[PDB]
Design a protein around this ligand. Structure first.
Ligand SMILES: [C][C]N([C][C])C1=[C][C]=C(C2=N[N]C(=O)[C][C]2[C])[C]=C1N([O])=O
Ligand SMILES: [C][C]N([C][C])C1=[C][C]=C(C2=N[N]C(=O)[C][C]2[C])[C]=C1N([O])=O
Ligand SMILES: [Mg+2]
Ligand SMILES: [Mg+2]
Ligand SMILES: [Mn+2]
Ligand SMILES: [Mn+2]
Ligand SMILES: [Zn+2]
Ligand SMILES: [Zn+2]
Lengths: 512, 371, 512, 371
């Protein structure tokens, strides 16, 4: 239920997440917890998609009335989700209540010391923290996947006769308990939970519902850490209780368990693909010579590679659609590493000689700039990998320290509007600077459209800066870092020919 | 036909001007005029003065006769081309001596050799001579004396493009530097009278030869950015420069000789202008040869349309600028405390020269635009 | 209250943490929560010290009686602490109930994709997660410190006239509220909590106690993120209440705040050292023309470098003492990056010719080894950086795939015992292999001591393997990786002369 | 005095034995016996056969006369030393041809040139000729023909230690390889009759020369571990080998020529033993020269106390072993599918030879221990 807003004036991806309740008191008093969780999930998915797609804006309609951002705030759950996604919220997120809408400006995710290339809401990889199954965080999942990739996946020793107790004792006792043909009610176990033992108690009515939900995560945790045994039908005090069921109920439960396990995504880093090796058994419980119920024992063998409880919860924006990253793409991202200067001189001279009014317009525009660089191109859209527009005479990109980058589009057609072309070019330029360029600060690109009359009259048809508003952090940029990011992006896009005035003469003499 | 040095090894008439060997802006051309262009004994006398100041003659028991004979032969080897002559070799030797010996603010000091013009009592200054062994310093000085030996007055690109025999011999890989080192060592090993290192053992001689060859080959500008990047990576490391590591000391010596080879823009206005005139004369001769051979004239080498200001500005902003910045950031740049801030004559001179060239370029562009 | 056990037979650092209650039910039913927290803290400190000191054993006396590890377990709080310290508990920790003691075998911390060089219980660096102050985890602290180190630490822009609300509005309102000379009781604020605003309500009796406790973390969070304002004396509904106090009480509170702020550790990455710029103000609250109480407003300016609430909680073992890492050392660790083969041939031949019985003893010992490498030295203690023992004839290190490394000590003295020397040498060898060597698997070193009689009689005085017991994971080692780690450790210790039989002849011919 | 090739450019009597050019264990010594040791036309005939099989004669319009003349001059240049003679050059050329042309299991294929002995219809096999451009393949073949030109029968270490003129000329930096490349290119450019690349443009000729020089210099064993480490780092990368990158193709060609230069241990028993006998004879001559000069005798070069088995085992386990392992792990090793597993003759032969040398060493040690 997240759609890309195509009617916005911003030169960036704007994701509309629908009506969202905002404010700490307003959100904590929401009667429908399902709606609150759905709104939180939508906002988190939009934020993850923008982080993975070069940054943008999340636009949310303020559902609650009489909401003031200064007086009410955002909401504890939303802030917790943002903190989970991002280590430093102020470095990436900006908040703005514009009229009836709430805008979250999200900077693109940048590679850092952690080594993460993308952001994930939940990797859905589980491990065993001695007794608990926990979903690996981004760093833990990264380490696990890289270790498995590096190694293409993943008898007894004589010891002194000393009476010791280890986890192997619990595992052996659980294995012996697994092979028992029948069980006696109200008997105590000789083992407890460990890295290889999990014990849960479920009601008969909720057993089928919870098998589809909690079994995948425990199976993933066992297959990821060391395998183990899951016992269903034992209370807190390790007393055998079981659940009452018929033979048909046992068959249906076994089928549901098989379907749930086979539904679990699996990624293999080895040459020999393997299935999840599991064994499901039902042990009858006899009380006073009569069958009380059944205990479900599931033995999960150690798996060679990654086992997912669900598909990894990572999102991005492709073809103006918010799409969840496929398992293969997510794995590839995780495990695989990565005055005023007028250039180029020849193109600037040609443009100024062919069109006299263009030079005057450029001088008038640049008289208000303290220091910066202006780069001309026949079509900046082509250099960014988009389709060429032959009606546009030329494009100019201005990079200055006191102002955000500005793209100047010039056209000779009086009765045609080039707002969409310029907006798309600016959006693509911002995305390339953020991701390919390597720029690690908040950046926005403004657009200015001019009509060049044959008689030399110049008019500013469209000025983006006067129609959109950004947080102040977006209005101050680092000129040197912007130029470096632009150079890197142009080099990686195979469109770097003469944009930067390097001393070719000097390097040619030297031989570099 | 051994090229033996003149019988008077020490010239007394120069003893006054050698007193100004302790300043960066050494009037080398005045020394050339005093000595005489015919004899060409400038490099030998300057090297003798520097060795006496260091004391390497007594440290390594260096024979005076063999040293003077070999350095006179080295002077004879240098050709009378406008820039890469014995004057440039003397300037580079003086520059490496100045960089190694003069006080450096904040440089901690750990056989070793100290110059007679250095104050060891003061603890607020240091010198590279106190962290680099005497053998390595002698190797650096000898390499600076040998850095551009037998230079043909042509760049590497010209030799490669024209398929010169030197380019074919070295397979288009650092033709000039390899030729200089090979010719210098062949001259050293050709005559017994040039062997001033007879008192060194076999291992020390091999290490000295390796250091000299590495320092000479570091002077190539084609690998300039490689050396700059390597030095920046080593300095920005938390470990920093380790003076107990042979590789780090070799890199420091290579950086010193590289900085000294292009020290011209870092001098005063008069010396910088004279060196620029010499180098552009050499470029014009190379361009005339290219025009004669039919190859397209290389940039900045067209006498008809000079671009001296553009060439100097580009060279300062791209080659000398980053190198000086890296050397100063490493902390090896000589200077003085001002009362605490550090004042460096080299950096100030470089900035002044760059501003002068920018002003000249702006004036020329304005004049062209008016017409 | 953690001491290194010098009476143990293990060839590793054994830390005694005193009596510890174990078992899930036993620990959850502990009446004294202070004692339980103290035991958890001691165990965590010992584990961190062992992780930072090359691994070892934590020995804890089982306080509760009739405790069975297989039946009871460990304890939820201890497992949570272990999970917080370590991403993968089974990779580093082994548990063994030996008699009346509980042994936790801890592997050394190894550098991984996360980039962490040491383990920290709590970095004590706080940041602002929009409304909350949270202690930076290891990855967040690493990123923050590296970013500050790289940069040597850390006007208005014209925008369209659009009615918008941002965090800057809350900051400006809080600043205006800060400068008010007097306040009116039961009036509502125009702002709420944000990245720069924190509002807390404290009782008069607990105010002095909580100033020494919670103020440092909020001050650290503000100084680390963007500065801000802390307001004490406002209830949940943002109504001005204040606390009743006298002028002497205000002076004492101001002095306590100043002492608490000046006590906070500060590390500077910049050239100009600076203090924490803070301003404390007391605003009177007037109700019906009478002074009700006071509101404490603390403005903390943005700080140039790291601000610590307390010293970083990282530990290690030095000089047989468990010491907390100093702030400088912790910062340096965080921000600064890093058949049978008989060798050497000459030494082996000399030892075999000088002592005839030594060769026979070596052959008898090695007849039971399938494949491995035996390295002889005059004194393996010297090669590890320890003091030489002249009474020991020679030392031999055996590396085999089926057995853990074994150090063979040989002596000619009949009436002297070399147990301590051999144990210390084995401990140092294990530590060097784990940390300097780079070995990333669980490793233990056994010792065997032999007496070489002048007539050729050999007797095994001490056999470590028969007297100590390890988890099975320690009895299987990777021979190639062990040899690689030993080579790296010897190279970094400047004691690598002829231990590995490299083809010097071939490399000499080639010139390498 | 131009060394022109004999008037019959193609020898018909060899047409039978050239039919066995498609197998790894090529009986090269039988070809030497058939052709005759006096004429020494083996390299020219083999190169002509390989060029005809590839079709580079028609692809680049290569003149036959100039090609044959230059390759005959190259044959004459090779000295009659036990190992580094024209037979070794022919063997290396055949090995590079075999590695580039023969089917490789699982190698995907993208002007380009294919051998006449390759089946393009099958989709389960690939060849390096289908991923490397024809110009680069010709450069690799020419470099393999030039890899050890004018070899003096002495190692780099011997030349450096004795201060040979070649060592001084190249400043003790890859003396042998630089000498080979320089002499080969000087011979190529000395006579117009040797210019078989007249149909190449100026840019293509420069690129060809650069590729040939790089491939020749890659044959140095002093930098063997550097190349192995670089190749392993490139292969272990998730990107892997990129055949659209010039640098990756150059590295692949360098690895191919390096593997072909030491292919002797990877052959059958008879060829391996003959090559070992030749190389140990050359080592014995070098050791005799060292003893005459008074320098200590280098290891494995003492005729009085041979260590042939130890030398071969060390060379296989340290040099040939890791190189073959890296080449096979990259996936460029020729082989066949067995029915799915891959069978490689080269790896099996290397393992068999290594086992033979280990058995010989164990037997010699047992015999020494008995006495
Ligand atoms: C031969 C090195 N080189 C020509 C490529 C060169 C030499 C000297 C100078 C030079 N220019 N200005 C001066 O002031 C004197 C020297 C440093 C510049 C260059 N260069 O790279 O163009
Ligand atoms: C000249 C290169 N080299 C001498 C250092 C050398 C050449 C040939 C062989 C060689 N040995 N065994 C064979 O089977 C034939 C060739 C490959 C080995 C070496 N080497 O490094 O010792
Ligand atoms: Mg030079
Ligand atoms: Mg060779
Ligand atoms: Mn020079
Ligand atoms: Mn060869
Ligand atoms: Zn698998
Ligand atoms: Zn600071």
């Amino acid at each position: 239920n997240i759609s890309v807003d195509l009617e916005t004036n911003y030169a960036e991806l704007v994701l509309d997440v629908g009506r969202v309740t905002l404010g700490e008191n307003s959100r904590k008093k929401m009667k429908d917890c399902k709606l609150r969780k759905k709104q939180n999930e939508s906002v988190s998915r939009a934020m993850c998609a923008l982080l993975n797609s070069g940054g943008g804006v999340i636009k949310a309609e303020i559902e609650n009335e009489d909401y003031s951002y200064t007086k009410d705030g955002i909401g504890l759950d939303l802030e917790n989700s943002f903190s989970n996604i991002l280590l430093f919220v102020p470095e990436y997120l900006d908040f703005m209540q514009n009229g009836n809408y709430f805008l979250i400006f999200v900077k693109s995710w940048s590679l850092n010391t952690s080594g993460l290339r993308i952001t994930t809401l939940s990797s859905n990889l589980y491990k065993r923290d001695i007794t608990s199954a926990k979903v690996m965080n981004a760093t833990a999942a990264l380490e696990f996947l890289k270790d498995m990739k590096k190694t293409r996946g993943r008898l007894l020793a004589k010891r002194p006769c000393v009476d010791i107790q280890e986890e192997n004792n619990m595992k052996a006792l659980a294995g012996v308990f697994f092979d028992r043909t029948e069980l006696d009610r109200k008997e105590k176990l000789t083992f407890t939970e460990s890295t290889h033992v999990e014990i849960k108690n479920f009601s008969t009515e909720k057993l089928l519902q919870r098998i589809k939900e909690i079994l995948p995560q425990y199976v993933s945790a066992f297959a990821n850490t060391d395998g183990g045994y899951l016992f269903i039908g034992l209370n807190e005090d390790k007393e055998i209780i079981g659940f009452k069921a018929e033979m048909s109920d046992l068959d249906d439960l076994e089928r549901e368990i098989e379907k749930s396990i086979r539904k679990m995504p699996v990624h293999h880093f080895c040459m020999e693909k393997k299935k999840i090796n599991y064994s499901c058994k039902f042990l009858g419980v006899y009380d006073k010579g009569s069958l009380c119920g059944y205990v479900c024992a599931l033995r999960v063998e150690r798996f060679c590679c990654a086992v997912f409880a669900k598909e990894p919860d990572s999102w991005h924006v492709k073809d103006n659609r918010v799409m969840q990253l496929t398992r293969k793409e997510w794995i590839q991202f995780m495990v695989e590493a990565e005055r005023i200067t007028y250039t180029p001189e020849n193109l600037c001279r040609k443009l100024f000689l062919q069109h006299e009014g263009l030079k005057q317009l450029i001088c008038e525009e640049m008289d208000s700039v303290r220091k910066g660089s202006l780069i001309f191109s026949r079509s900046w859209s082509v250099d960014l990998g988009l389709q060429e527009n032959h009606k546009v005479l030329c494009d100019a990109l201005l990079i200055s320290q006191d102002s955000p980058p500005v793209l100047y589009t010039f056209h000779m057609v009086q009765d045609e509007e080039f707002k969409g072309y310029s907006t798309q070019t600016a959006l693509t330029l911002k995305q390339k600077l953020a991701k390919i360029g390597g720029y690690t600060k908040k950046v926005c690109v403004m657009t200015k459209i001019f009509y060049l009359s044959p008689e030399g009259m110049t008019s500013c048809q469209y000025d983006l800066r006067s129609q959109v508003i950004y947080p102040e952090s977006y209005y101050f940029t680092r000129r040197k870092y912007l130029l470096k990011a632009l150079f890197k992006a142009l080099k990686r896009l195979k469109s770097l020919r003469d944009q930067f005035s390097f001393a070719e003469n000097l390097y040619q003499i030297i031989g570099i | 036909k051994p090229i033996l040095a003149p019988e008077p090894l020490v010239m007394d008439n120069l003893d006054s001007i050698m007193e100004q060997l302790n300043t960066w802006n050494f009037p080398i051309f005045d020394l050339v005029e005093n000595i005489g262009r015919k004899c060409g004994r400038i490099l030998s006398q300057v090297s003798y003065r520097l060795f006496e100041d260091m004391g390497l003659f007594e440290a390594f028991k260096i024979p005076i006769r063999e040293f003077m004979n070999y350095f006179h032969a080295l002077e004879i080897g240098y050709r009378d081309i406008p820039y890469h002559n014995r004057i440039h070799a003397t300037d580079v030797l003086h520059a490496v001596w100045y960089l190694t010996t003069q006080p450096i603010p904040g440089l901690s000091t750990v056989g070793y050799v100290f110059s007679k013009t250095y104050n060891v009592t003061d603890d607020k200054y240091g010198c590279l001579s106190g962290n680099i062994p005497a053998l390595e310093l002698m190797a650096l000085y000898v390499a600076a004396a040998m850095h551009d030996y037998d230079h043909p007055g042509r760049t590497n690109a010209f030799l490669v493009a024209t398929s010169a025999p030197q380019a074919v011999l070295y397979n288009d890989r650092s033709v000039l530097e390899n030729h200089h080192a090979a010719a210098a060592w062949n001259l050293f090993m050709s005559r017994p009278e040039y062997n001033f290192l007879i008192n060194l053992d076999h291992v020390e001689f091999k290490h000295f030869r390796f250091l000299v060859i590495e320092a000479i080959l570091a002077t190539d500008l084609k690998k300039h950015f490689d050396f700059v990047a390597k030095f920046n990576g080593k300095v920005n490391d938390d470990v920093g420069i380790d003076w107990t590591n042979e590789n780090d000391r070799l890199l420091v010596c290579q950086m010193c000789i590289k900085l000294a080879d292009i020290n011209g823009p870092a001098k005063c206005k008069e010396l910088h202008l004279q060196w620029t005139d010499g180098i552009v004369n050499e470029f014009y001769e190379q361009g005339d040869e290219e025009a004669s051979l039919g190859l397209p004239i290389s940039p900045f080498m067209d006498r008809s349309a000079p671009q001296l200001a553009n060439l100097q500005e580009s060279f300062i902003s791209h080659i000398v600028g980053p190198l000086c910045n890296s050397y100063d950031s490493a902390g090896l740049m000589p200077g003085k405390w001002v009362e605490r801030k550090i004042y460096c004559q080299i950096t100030q001179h470089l900035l002044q020269n760059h501003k002068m060239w920018k002003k000249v370029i702006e004036e020329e562009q304005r004049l062209a635009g008016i017409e």
